[PDB]
Design an enzyme around this catalytic site. Structure first.
Site, PDB file in Angstrom:
ATOM      1  N   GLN C 141       0.791  -1.333  -0.317  1.00  0.00           N
ATOM      2  CA  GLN C 141       0.093   0.001   0.043  1.00  0.00           C
ATOM      3  C   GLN C 141       0.774   1.033   0.251  1.00  0.00           C
ATOM      4  OE1 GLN C 141      -1.639   1.974   3.377  1.00  0.00           O
ATOM      5  NE2 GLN C 141      -3.234   0.429   3.476  1.00  0.00           N
ATOM      6  N   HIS C 143       1.172   6.118   0.100  1.00  0.00           N
ATOM      7  CA  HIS C 143       0.847   7.275   0.271  1.00  0.00           C
ATOM      8  C   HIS C 143       0.636   8.085  -1.012  1.00  0.00           C
ATOM      9  CE1 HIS C 143       1.959   7.032   4.504  1.00  0.00           C
ATOM     10  NE2 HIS C 143       0.701   6.634   4.712  1.00  0.00           N
ATOM     11  N   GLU C 170      -3.551   5.726  -0.911  1.00  0.00           N
ATOM     12  CA  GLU C 170      -3.776   6.139   0.004  1.00  0.00           C
ATOM     13  C   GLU C 170      -3.132   7.387   0.010  1.00  0.00           C
ATOM     14  OE1 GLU C 170      -2.625   5.288   4.120  1.00  0.00           O
ATOM     15  OE2 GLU C 170      -4.195   5.699   5.002  1.00  0.00           O
ATOM     16  N   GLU C 221      -9.239   3.217   5.762  1.00  0.00           N
ATOM     17  CA  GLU C 221      -8.522   2.754   7.344  1.00  0.00           C
ATOM     18  C   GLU C 221      -7.889   3.126   8.367  1.00  0.00           C
ATOM     19  OE1 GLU C 221      -4.271   2.830   5.969  1.00  0.00           O
ATOM     20  OE2 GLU C 221      -4.202   0.550   5.691  1.00  0.00           O
ATOM     21  N   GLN C 296      -4.854  -1.343  10.236  1.00  0.00           N
ATOM     22  CA  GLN C 296      -3.835  -1.166  10.172  1.00  0.00           C
ATOM     23  C   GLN C 296      -2.855  -1.171  11.400  1.00  0.00           C
ATOM     24  OE1 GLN C 296      -1.515   2.475   7.764  1.00  0.00           O
ATOM     25  NE2 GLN C 296      -3.166   3.624   9.321  1.00  0.00           N
ATOM     26  N   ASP C 335       5.423   2.697   7.396  1.00  0.00           N
ATOM     27  CA  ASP C 335       4.487   3.974   6.512  1.00  0.00           C
ATOM     28  C   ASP C 335       5.270   5.654   7.479  1.00  0.00           C
ATOM     29  OD1 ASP C 335       3.400   2.864   8.714  1.00  0.00           O
ATOM     30  OD2 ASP C 335       1.324   3.937   8.368  1.00  0.00           O
ATOM     31  N   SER C 362       1.643  -0.063   5.269  1.00  0.00           N
ATOM     32  CA  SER C 362       0.582   0.007   4.413  1.00  0.00           C
ATOM     33  C   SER C 362       0.784   1.750   5.134  1.00  0.00           C
ATOM     34  CB  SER C 362       0.190   0.129   6.082  1.00  0.00           C
ATOM     35  OG  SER C 362       0.086   0.625   7.633  1.00  0.00           O
TER      36      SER C 362
END
Ligand code: COY
Ligand code: COY
Ligand SMILES: [K+]
Ligand SMILES: [K+]
Ligand SMILES: [K+]
Ligand SMILES: [K+]
EC number: 4.2.1.28
Lengths: 137, 178, 551, 551, 137, 178
Positions: C141, C143, C170, C221, C296, C335, C362
């Site tokens: 995943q 950003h 995200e 999330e 998460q 992350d 994440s």
């Protein structure tokens, strides 16, 4: 009842996901979208579908996930703005006990949201004890 | 010292005063922010920011939560303008307003080590613009990928310490000048 | 006199990091604290009367929620009576199946499972994680932000991330009133890079739900839970309001997970004298109890807190393992910045990268960290080549792949174009062709023409004010000649109608094929079993830039 | 126009590293090559007639040496018949004892054990390595060198490295004729830092043995073997000259190990079409066959060769695992540069650091890499603080500890002063007070006054040509005000009389106590068993500089 | 026959370890070094010590290590320069077959080093076959 | 094409020359070193360094091994002065001496990418000075921790290719240099 063998519904039983509107997945086309044959409500998941998925969850050994999905199926009947109202009412120090009980009676009586009404009623007595009601701050 | 509780703070009258809500240790157990900028100077520039915009600046010490949002919320209840500025001893700051949920706000300054006295004055300034329902352009965004690496643990310790001065159910106190 | 050896050492980046000696009483200790409670449980007539020392008369809201919904009560006494050292052994033993352990770990109390995993070193945890991970295939995943909230850049970056292999992406906001723009930008561009990529826009809880109702996201999330009741309260929620929110997302067909992570309660002032790991376990059980599919965690935004103390990075892997041992999807952080040191941040990431998790990070930043609006990720766009090289070095599938400059350029370009059409059909502040070429070739927002914050934000706020929904995006796509994208956009909503991707670990791959723990069953049983990097995917991973052909 | 994203990536240090597409016909492939032989053995009247494909008629010296001495012929047929996947599963299964495995692995052919470990991922290999490691206690080895062969500096760097925790330290020369000074300087400085640290001086084979015969070293390691006959020949040895050499060291009471490492045969032009791992397995069996207790491997100086191709760093961990699994001490490299990237070299090091090996590195540079005379190590003096922080973060015993500047200064000073006394007493070219001071506070040779290398080399030469032995060093220390140090030197000489430290993995700790696999038996059986970082050692590792007490 | 229970010798049975020339471990003192009561020639491991260690290695399940120790025990009788000569003789292309066989005869008849003699005759035979004798390069 | 094989090299008779011994692909299948310096230029500078010191330079090509120590040993066997310089196509260089073991030398240049044309000449100069039994100070040490990272794989590939031209038992060829 739906089983893990039935999943994914989209691949194995797409005709099971026919909307309450009674139009299939295959109806959701750009053209249909364009011609307004299909519209914003049209893509609302149904309680029927969520109950299907709840059973698969159960079958998959995930009872709490199934439970969540059962609440969800109930909550499909509650309008968006009403959802937000009730969420906010459950946040700390927002509500009186009676206000929460009114929300639960409403869920049960107007929307037949039985499980969610019990959930809220539960919150109401424990917010009393743990002092998370209006004025407890 | 520099801060004097002059009794429980009362609801505001005029829609052209900005409250600065201060954490329960601001200028007491803690006197400087996470990077050394003193509390007096910080109050200095915030006030000056508001006043120079022609609005009254009121200050109160918040008690029912050391969380910067909740203390800003405490102040927005009493600000005659409905606009408030919440400030933690470590320095974190928020511009709030009545009608907003506590974890919403007008402007947030979520990396205190990046703030400067000039930043504090712009905040006061902007708070005043909002109080006149002016719609100031927002304070320019400050951000540094290494701020947490260098300061989050210290932020934590400072917050632990201020938090020991929270009093549940206790109403904000009004405070007098330098 | 100074030692020049120590002078050189003093200058190293790692010594800029925040380190702290343990502070047991304020819970400033990562794990294995003598204040953590002894595992215990009492049940009467199918209800918990005692939980980890505490009588039900003393339960806080978290105790009640976990006791009433978070624990497999059918085997809880059984498992409580088993030796924690044996249970740890079972966790990393390749010959004890995941399906044999799940009934037992989900029956453990929070203190019990914490006690079990604390017997483990990180090699054992990793050995266990590869087995307990719910999805057989590891994913990733990213950003996708920038400090300007520039929508055409987000779209381009989104498209590139999808193309590099992220299956979830995200975004969030430098200025909160920009949010609907960010969301739509992310969705469009993500679909351009790879249809099926899931997108979220992280906001305050009521605001995020509403954007999901409007159809501008595909999942959520950052639905936060906390491990002490005062901290939860400062988080402005209870287990029941977060439980209600969870079901609210599902009732609109949106996949969601909660977010937690060690150190939040310390950071927020009330650890109740417990270790970060023990309080995090409470968070994981809150997630379980709520019926939420996944989580998460791995400190996430609070990573400066456990990383400051001993064994903090081991505690972070331990909280990820507890998460997967509880049969929850684990989006395992990696992350958020915690160090100035490349060595150090690499050691922290490999804990999850090596065994593989549902989402190895994440929020890998798919932009340079200057543009990262979560105050920096543990990896950013400048590490992409290193990440691919390490995949190749170790024959580890870290979910991403080497890519061609020409393809990325094309892909960012069609995404910028598509968002341009969208603002067009929707009558949003125009995206010039200038902007499109710049987002095509940008590294970051420093490479983008400034926009009128005022005209975007005004129209942004109106999208929510006036309840402008996803259909508007779809039509505009079709109108501007991006039927494909518009179809692909329609296909996401379609998934929403079927509910299949609501399940544990679900992502959507290939031709709209759901891939979740239900139909991508992790079947690890030691060497040569379970997920293995091989075939075409290995060939893809081997093909890094600069590999000279010897002949 | 160029992508600014790709322009930033192109500048990353990792893209300076050498990468290569596999070249299978030339063996430029790390492992799992289609040309590697299928495991097989045939034995007739107790003599092997076929080994891994090859009939005895075609055996080269390496086949002969291995078939005659490297495999337990009594169980070889039994073990060949076992399933390689189950055996690989046994390696990482925490409940299959090391002692149950060693009887099986030592009866495997080279191809067979390669086939076994090739079924494993690196997480599985790490899980296995912690168990198969011969010594219960992991350790560490450092290089002590400088580009000037400055003996004062080497003594000081050696004292600091011993103080930091290295149990073995290794010097070598910029200018080969300096060797006896380097050796003596290393030995003295090492005993000042920690009495018991073992020292070696890596040279041409005959030259190194002679140095050892004169008593100026404690062990030898760079006793090279190679995995193809033509390459072994260009290494100016055969399995028989190298076995004789091994026995020659032991006949002088000196500890020794062989050195090998994946990629040597590629580097030296003759891979005979085989993968690096398969050829390295032959090297490992040559070592076993010779009756040598231990091996330095994990590519070592040829690390640029496996690292260039896919799964090369995984292969490196695999070769270490084969070494330990065949019941040999493994000094597991992590001692040579292969990358410009901090991320990448960290991932390569953690494969051995996380599980623990007999020597996690066989040559961490205890000097800044500019002074490293093996052309750079994977870690150097400037990484010491990072290393200690990762130990603390993960609760992993990496063999080293945080130390105080004032202790290091005192210890470096004493080392220089002792060596000063040595040179004076032996009539060697003086060491001045100025040089003692510089060595005390130095970071590396840039901080040292230049010496007259003509005078040094002449007297160093005369140590050799006049056979000036180790007791001359002991007397000069004793006569020069350094009785304690003289006693410690004498003690490490006396270790050469007992044979005790000749055994598998032996180091010498505490008060001259031998610590080997014979008396420090690895007894791993999963979580909470085997060597565990804890107690005072954990406290020591937690105590890094910059860790502020929260209160 | 020594076993791992007898290891370490320095702790378990220091007496067993008495050198080249009947010095004991405890005879190696700074004082005796300094008075030359003890010298380098006294400080030499014995064939007995190495054969004891060979038994311990075997007891530890390391037969080839033991065999190495058995060869070393024999070589303690061979002088340092002769050791280096024989090592160099074994290196590729240094020796003729007859020269290796004579090193082998000498090992046996002068030093009773029968294992090392066998080892060297084995290399001679294989050095012919694999062509690593003088002139074969 | 700048090197011609003119017959089996014979042993030198007087202490008046240095042999330059090159690998079997030098100036042939390979024509520049690992960092692109032309073999022609390398040979030019080493010969000039030797002649600079009033000594003869004699060039041979070696076949029995491609290893630079064995290459240089073939040359020291034939050198009137006992002194030789071994050079591989990739550029690795060694100064060797009749009497030394193959893997011992007088000076070694084990990081070919660091060599310059100025180094090669210095190398020839030192070789001559050895020949004349002076004790030249060694060419200063070149070292760089990133040389293997950057170049070891390439060095392996170039060595593999030169090694294909090895011929067991083929005696060195004297070379005419254009
Ligand atoms: C650490 C952090 C936190 C954590 C600590 C907060 C605290 N109260 O102590 C954490 C994870 C618990 C957290 C929660 C929230 C909650 C609010 C809770 C609260 N009462 O504060 C939140 C509402 C999310 C939610 N789903 O409810 C929230 C949000 C939205 C945001 C944004 C605010 C936007 C705005 N309002 O304008 C934000 C800018 C991110 C973004 N780009 O949108 C950021 C400030 C976002 C920040 C990104 C950014 N751009 O700065 C980020 C990533 C770094 C800040 C920092 O380290 N500064 C360095 C430090 C030394 O300086 P400092 O001044 O002392 O920093 C303080 C402030 O930032 C403050 N603070 C942090 N967030 C926040 C929000 C508000 C409204 C206010 C008034 C003050 C807030 O806390 C720190 C420490 O005291 C951050 N947070 Co929070 C980020 C949430 C991310 C997802 C959930 N999540 C992630 N990790 C975990 C976890 N382990 N457990 C549970 N949940 C999570 N946050 N955060 N957060
Ligand atoms: C890589 C390397 C090797 C490897 C490659 C050798 C080859 N011929 O292909 C390796 C491991 C096989 C090796 C062996 C030896 C053998 C010689 C074998 C041989 N025929 O060359 C050796 C005699 C050791 C022994 N026990 O026998 C030897 C020595 C002593 C040395 C030193 C020479 C001193 C001197 N004579 O003045 C040396 C300077 C180290 C030191 N400080 O003492 C170094 C050059 C030492 C070097 C340190 C340094 N300061 O440079 C170092 C570490 C880096 C060189 C490099 O990468 N340069 C970059 C490259 C791009 O440039 P290049 O010009 O192409 O480099 C070539 C030359 O260096 C050449 N070369 C390398 N060594 C060497 C030695 C001699 C005498 C000559 C003439 C030419 C030599 O090989 C490379 C590749 O073609 C190096 N080696 Co070697 C060091 C060995 C360390 C312990 C054993 N060891 C470590 N790893 C492994 C393994 N996987 N398998 C088996 N054994 C080992 N080496 N090496 N080596
Ligand atoms: K937590
Ligand atoms: K995330
Ligand atoms: K090898
Ligand atoms: K070494």
């Amino acid at each position: 009842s739906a089983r893990v063998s039935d999943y994914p519904l989209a691949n194995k039983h797409p005709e099971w996901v026919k909307t309450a509107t009674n139009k299939t997945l295959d109806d959701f086309t750009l053209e249909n979208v364009l011609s307004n044959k299909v519209t914003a409500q049209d893509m609302r998941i149904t309680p029927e579908t969520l109950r299907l998925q709840a059973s698969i969850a159960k079958d998959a050994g995930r009872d709490r996930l199934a439970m969540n999905f059962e609440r969800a199926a109930e909550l499909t009947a509650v309008p968006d703005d009403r959802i937000l109202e009730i969420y906010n009412a459950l946040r700390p120090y927002r509500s009186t006990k009676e206000e929460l009980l009114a929300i639960a009676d409403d869920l049960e009586s107007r929307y037949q949201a039985k499980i969610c009404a019990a959930f809220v009623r539960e919150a109401a007595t424990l917010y009393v004890e743990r002092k998370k009601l209006k004025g407890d701050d | 010292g520099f801060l004097t509780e002059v009794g429980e703070a009362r609801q505001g009258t005029q829609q052209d005063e900005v409250i600065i809500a201060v954490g329960p240790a601001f200028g007491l157990a803690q006197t400087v922010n996470i990077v050394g900028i003193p509390h007096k100077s910080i109050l200095r520039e915030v006030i000056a920011g508001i006043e120079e915009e022609g609005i009254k600046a009121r200050v109160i010490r918040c008690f029912k939560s050391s969380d910067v949002a909740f203390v800003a919320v405490e102040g927005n209840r009493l600000s005659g303008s409905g606009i408030s500025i919440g400030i933690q001893s470590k320095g974190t700051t928020v511009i709030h307003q009545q009608g907003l949920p506590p974890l919403s706000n007008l402007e947030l300054f979520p990396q205190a080590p990046l703030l400067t006295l000039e930043t504090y004055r712009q905040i006061g300034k902007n708070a005043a613009r909002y109080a006149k329902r002016e719609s100031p352009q927002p304070v320019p965004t400050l951000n540094d990928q290494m701020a947490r690496p260098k300061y989050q643990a210290k932020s934590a310790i400072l917050h632990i310490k201020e938090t020991k001065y929270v009093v549940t159910g206790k109403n904000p106190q009004e405070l007098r000048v330098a | 006199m100074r030692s020049k050896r120590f002078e050189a050492l003093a200058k190293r980046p790692v010594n800029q990091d925040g380190f702290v000696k343990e502070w047991i009483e304020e819970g400033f200790i990562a794990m294995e604290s003598p204040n953590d409670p002894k595992p215990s449980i009492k049940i009467v007539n199918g209800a918990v009367t005692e939980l980890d020392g505490k009588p039900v008369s003393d339960f806080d809201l978290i105790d009640h929620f976990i006791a009433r919904y978070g624990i497999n009560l059918n085997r809880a006494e059984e498992v409580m009576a088993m030796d924690s050292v044996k249970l740890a052994n079972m966790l990393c033993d390749p010959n004890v199946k995941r399906s044999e352990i799940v009934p037992l770990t989900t029956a453990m109390t929070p203190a019990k499972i914490v006690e079990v995993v604390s017997h483990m070193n990180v090699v054992e945890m990793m050995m266990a994680m590869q087995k307990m991970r719910a999805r057989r295939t590891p994913s990733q995943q990213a950003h996708v932000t920038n400090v300007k909230d520039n929508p055409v850049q987000i779209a381009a970056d989104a498209a590139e991330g999808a193309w590099r292999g992220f299956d979830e992406q995200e975004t969030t906001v430098a200025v909160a009133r920009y949010a609907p723009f960010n969301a739509i930008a992310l969705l469009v561009g993500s679909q351009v890079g790879r249809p099926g990529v899931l997108t979220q826009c992280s906001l305050e809880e009521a605001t995020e739900l509403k954007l999901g109702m409007l159809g501008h996201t595909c999942y959520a999330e950052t639905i936060s839970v906390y491990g002490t009741e005062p901290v939860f309260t400062d988080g402005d929620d209870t287990p029941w309001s977060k439980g209600f929110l969870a079901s609210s997302y599902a009732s609109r067909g949106l996949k969601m997970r909660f977010t937690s992570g060690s150190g939040s309660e310390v950071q927020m002032g009330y650890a109740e004298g417990k270790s970060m790991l023990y309080l995090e376990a409470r968070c994981i059980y809150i997630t379980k109890a709520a019926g939420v599919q996944g989580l998460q965690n791995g400190s996430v935004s609070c990573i400066g807190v456990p990383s400051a103390v001993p064994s903090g990075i081991r505690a972070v892997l331990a909280e990820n393992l507890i998460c997967s041992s509880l049969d929850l999807e684990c989006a395992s952080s990696n992350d958020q910045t915690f160090t100035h040191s490349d060595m150090r941040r690499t050691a922290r990431l490999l804990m999850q990268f090596l065994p593989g998790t549902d989402f190895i990070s994440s929020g890998y930043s798919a932009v340079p960290n200057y543009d990262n609006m979560f105050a920096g990720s543990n990896e950013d766009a400048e590490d992409f080549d290193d990440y691919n090289v390490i995949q190749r070095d170790l024959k580890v599938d870290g979910g991403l792949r080497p890519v061609r400059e020409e393809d990325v350029i094309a892909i960012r370009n069609k995404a910028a174009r598509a968002l341009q059409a969208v603002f067009a059909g929707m009558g949003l502040p125009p995206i010039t062709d200038e902007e499109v070429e710049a987002a095509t070739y940008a590294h970051g927002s420093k490479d983008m023409p400034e926009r009128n914050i005022v005209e975007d934000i005004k129209f942004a706020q109106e999208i929510i004010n006036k309840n402008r929904n996803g259909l508007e995006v779809v039509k505009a796509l079709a109108q501007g000649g991006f039927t494909d994208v518009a179809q692909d956009m329609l296909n996401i909503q379609k998934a929403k109608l079927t509910g299949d991707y609501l399940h544990t670990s679900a992502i959507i791959v290939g031709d709209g094929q759901v891939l979740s723990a239900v139909n991508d069953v992790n079947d690890y049983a030691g060497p040569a079993t379970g997920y293995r990097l091989q075939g075409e995917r290995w060939e893809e991973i081997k093909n890094i830039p600069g590999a000279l052909d010897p002949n």
